[PDB]
């Protein structure tokens, strides 16, 4: 199946998703709220568990300066890469491995904001530990948004440390969570 690009320079764009997760108000609102809040012109984006790779190249065509696609399933990874190509934009990069390995293994150069739509086979005290290494090992620095899209029936996340939460979103049977690093 195929989603749109919803706004920035590719707003539009057709992108295909991988065999479904199971919308475009999750996403619209996603962005709406975040860049509400921060500009997205120049950021360093995480998208982990990327999936269809919707979340991160909203991000890029919306300004974004780099997005770093984390994704364990190699038909998914290959459907992002088809989509960076589709969109044409610079600033993607693809990291197809064990998201929670990735996540461990850590960075050198944090970024602005990091995107999550964890699958459902994912337990939400999973999740949880994710969101603390992202703390941790330098993938986020001081004013970091951090965004999780999960179904309604999982268990809230757990926030770690200095991040502060952001009004929690319903959209439908989909709960974000957002939250930015102090």
């Known amino acids: 199946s195929m989603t749109r690009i ?10 295909a998703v991988p065999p479904r997760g199971t919308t475009d ?6 962005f709406n709220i975040v860049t509400a809040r921060r500009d997205l012109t120049g950021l360093a984006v ?9 979340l991160g190249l909203e991000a890029l065509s919306r300004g974004a300066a780099s997005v770093l696609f984390v994704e364990s399933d190699q038909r998914s990874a290959a459907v992002i890469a088809r989509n960076i190509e ?8 693809l990291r197809r491995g064990a998201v929670a390995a990735v996540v461990a293994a850590g960075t050198t150069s944090p970024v602005d904001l990091v995107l999550a739509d964890p699958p459902y086979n994912v337990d939400s005290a999973d999740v949880d530990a994710i969101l603390a290494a992202l703390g941790t090992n330098g993938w986020t620095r001081e004013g970091t948004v951090a965004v999780v899209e999960r179904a309604t029936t999982c268990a809230p996340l757990t926030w770690p440390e200095g991040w502060r939460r952001w009004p929690q979103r319903v959209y439908g049977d989909t709960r974000l969570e957002l939250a930015e690093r102090l």
């Open 6 to 15: 919803i706004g920035g320079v590719a707003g539009g764009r057709r992108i």
């Open 46 to 54: 995480l998208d982990l568990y990327a999936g269809s790779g919707a």
């Open 86 to 93: 589709a969109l044409g934009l610079s600033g993607a990069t």
């Open 25 to 30: 108000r999750v996403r619209e609102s996603l």
